[PDB]
Amino acid sequence: IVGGTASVRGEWPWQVTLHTTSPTQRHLCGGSIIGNQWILTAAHCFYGVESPKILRVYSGILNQSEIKEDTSFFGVQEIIIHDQYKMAESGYDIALLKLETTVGYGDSQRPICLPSKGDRNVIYTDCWVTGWGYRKLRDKIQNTLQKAKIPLVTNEECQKRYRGHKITHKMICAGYREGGKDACKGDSGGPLSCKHNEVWHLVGITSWGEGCAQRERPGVYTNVVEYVDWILEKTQAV
Ligand SMILES: COC(=O)Nc1ccc(-c2[nH]c([C@H](Cc3ccccc3)NC(=O)CCc3cc(Cl)ccc3-n3cnnn3)nc2Cl)cc1
Numbered sequence: 254i255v256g257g258t259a260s261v262r263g264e265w266p267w268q269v270t271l272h273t274t275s276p277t278q279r280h281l282c283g284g285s286i287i288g289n290q291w292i293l294t295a296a297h298c299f300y301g302v303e304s305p306k307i308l309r310v311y312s313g314i315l316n317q318s319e320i321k322e323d324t325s326f327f328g329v330q331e332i333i334i335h336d337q338y339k340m341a342e343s344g345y346d347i348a349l350l351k352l353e354t355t356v357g358y359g360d361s362q363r364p365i366c367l368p369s370k371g372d373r374n375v376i377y378t379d380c381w382v383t384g385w386g387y388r389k390l391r392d393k394i395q396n397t398l399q400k401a402k403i404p405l406v407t408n409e410e411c412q413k414r415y416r417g418h419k420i421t422h423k424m425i426c427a428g429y430r431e432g433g434k435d436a437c438k439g440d441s442g443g444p445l446s447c448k449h450n451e452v453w454h455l456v457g458i459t460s461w462g463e464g465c466a467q468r469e470r471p472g473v474y475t476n477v478v479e480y481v482d483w484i485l486e487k488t489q490a491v
Pocket residue numbers: 279280281282297298299300386393394435436437438439440441442459460461462463464465466471472473474
């Protein structure tokens with residue numbers, strides 16, 4: 254996160270850190286708890302990931318230093334990538350992790366509500382991007398989960414900012430015209446959380462951008478509302 258500040262423990266209890274074990278253990282991507290055995294994240298995070306056996310999901314984490322070999326985690330039973338996904342820049346940048354065991358909800362780990370189909374017409378004015386990602390293009394993973402409040406940008410305005418790309422309605426953009434606050438390397442797959450009527454909703458999934466927090470380059474997010482039926486298809490399978 255560029256231009257963000259330290260989160261307070263328990264502030265974003267749906268935020269997870271997805272680690273890879275191969276070749277060595279490290280943070281890979283962000284994710285959000287959406288159900289007791291479900292993590293919603295970005296499809297691009299799994300480039301070259303050949304098995305869910307190398308993945309570890311850590312919930313209830315503020316600082317990466319809380320993670321040692323004796324720290325409990327959730328194993329991943331299955332990686333579900335949207336079957337239309339080719340690359341982040343073309344959309345369908347969404348994946349589900351089905352956990353081997355059930356998350357016990359509490360003040361440190363709980364789910365974020367998915368947006369409602371009716372909420373496609375609501376205007377979100379209180380949106381935040383969170384993660385352990387870089388504070389600039391050449392940096393390192395941060396110990397403390399960072400947060401940054403970012404304004405949502407219309408599809409028309411985002412398309413003007415990305416000439417040569419096709420910004421679809423399955424993407425949602427966020428950023429200040431002057432830059433300064435955005436997601437960066439290591440934040441992808443994490444949430445873009447918006448508060449509306451005292452309830453937080455998972456509005457976006459950190460996906461892609463041209464550099465980090467650059468002037469007139471909003472961050473591009475998977476527009477979660479456009480995938481509610483796909484999420485329910487995969488999570489509510491009979
Ligand atoms: C010790 O552990 C580590 O150092 N772990 C570590 C884990 C992941 C990364 C990392 N993550 C990303 C991954 C893409 C990816 C995933 C998984 C594997 C490989 C690539 N991108 C991101 O997190 C941010 C993409 C992005 C979104 C938005 Cl909304 C706005 C701007 C951008 N950026 C553009 N240019 N940079 N950031 N790029 C890098 Cl580099 C870097 C370091």
